[PDB]
Amino acid sequence: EIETIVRESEANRIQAQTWFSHPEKSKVSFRYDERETSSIRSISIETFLSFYSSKFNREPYSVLDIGCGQGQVIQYLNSRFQKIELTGIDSSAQAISSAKKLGINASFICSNAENIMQYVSKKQDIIFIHLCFGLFKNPIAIVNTLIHLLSDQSCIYIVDLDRNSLGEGLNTAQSREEEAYLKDQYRASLTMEEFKQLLHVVTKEQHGVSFHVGNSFIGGFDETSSQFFSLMRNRNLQDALRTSVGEQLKQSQMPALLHGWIIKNKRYT
């Protein structure tokens, strides 16, 4: 079913991606994303760091950022850890050029995520796909490729738009062009059920691999579930929650996002 949904929806994902590949449209998307999603990005990073520590009882050694933009995630991670192997990939040359100007000890690659194996061979502890999964022409193929790059103790963490959150998404727009941008992005997005089906398809074909999907603000983990408690106790995630969307303004206008994990814990003989 999901393979069909993905294929028939391909034009919608092509249209969404125009907002990142043309200079004028890219100004609109960059402004919106940095104004509205920067806080979310911090929360998402602290979420995966906290999850990784709780799940594997160690810190990650390597992180790969898919659709890394101007390298904001990699910069955040670079200041957090003294030693960590960092890689970012993005198909926008302008984004990668900007990322390289940060002067960080990290590898930035300009290519379609499809081609990652031609650039990266070392296994990754965390592969992060933040607010860009709906832009890929072939998302099933991408994830299958990335699973091959996962280390012994690893996860793919995907955060993306929920198709059903369109109304709330539009409330955040501050211009008609932002409305147009968001409409195009949401048209490319999946429902929660479709997202869950997608992760089911890519994981049950893999040894030592489980998955989790949810709408909960904290990593999609239900507020009666186990990982939720570990996360809510985490000092770093708590810090991020305070000053991310901790302004006045009375209300926040928060569209619910999809949160997906592909978790690998290889058992050796």
Q: Which residues participate in the annotated binding site for S-adenosyl-L-homocysteine?
A: 41, 90, 112-113
Among 32, 36, 41, 146, binds ligand SAH (CB under 6 A): 41
- Distance, in Å, from the CA atom of 96 to the CA atom of 130, rounded to the nearest integer, reads 16
Among 60, 69, 139, 260, binds ligand SAH (CB under 6 A): 69
**Are β-strands 85-90 and 124-130 bridged in parallel, bridged antiparallel, or unpaired?**
unpaired
Give backbone dihedrals phi and psi of 105, rounded to 5 degrees, phi first: -75, 85
Q: Which is nearer to ligand SAH, 34 or 222 (CB)?
A: 34
Please work out the total of residues on this chain that contact ligand SAH, with binding judged by CB under 6 A.
19
Kindly tell me the sign of the dihedral angle through the C-alpha atoms of 104, 38, 69, 124: positive
Among 49, 86, 131, 257, binds ligand SAH (CB under 6 A): 131
Among 15, 53, 75, 112, binds ligand SAH (CB under 6 A): 112
Residue 208 DSSP symbol: T
Contact window for ligand SAH (CB under 6 A) among 130-138, 146-154, 185-193, 260-268: 130-138
Among 95, 147, 190, 257, binds ligand SAH (CB under 6 A): 95
- Asked whether the beta carbons of 201 and 144 are under 8 A apart, the reply is no
Alpha helices in 22-124 (DSSP H): 23-36, 38-56, 72-80, 93-100
Does position 92 bind ligand SAH by CB under 6 A? yes
Among 2, 6, 20, 218, binds ligand SAH (CB under 6 A): 20
Does position 132 bind ligand SAH by CB under 6 A? yes
- Distance, in Å, from the CA atom of 61 to the CA atom of 220, rounded to the nearest integer, reads 24
Residue 150 DSSP symbol: E
Contact window for ligand SAH (CB under 6 A) among 85-93, 162-170, 209-217, 219-227: 85-93
- Asked whether the beta carbons of 213 and 192 are under 8 A apart, the reply is yes
Residue 100 CB, shortest distance to ligand SAH, in Å, is 14
* Number of H-type helices and E-type strands within the chain: 12, 7
Does position 15 bind ligand SAH by CB under 6 A? no
Residue 92 CB, shortest distance to ligand SAH, in Å, is 4
Fill in the amino acid letter for 192: M
Does position 153 bind ligand SAH by CB under 6 A? no
**Collapsed DSSP state (helix, strand, coil) of residue 22:** coil
Q: Which is nearest to 70 in space by CA: 28, 35, 22, 110? A: 110
Among 42, 47, 91, 185, binds ligand SAH (CB under 6 A): 91
Q: Give residues in contact with ligand SAH (CB under 6 A).
A: 17, 20, 33, 41, 67-69, 89-92, 95, 112-113, 130-132, 135-136
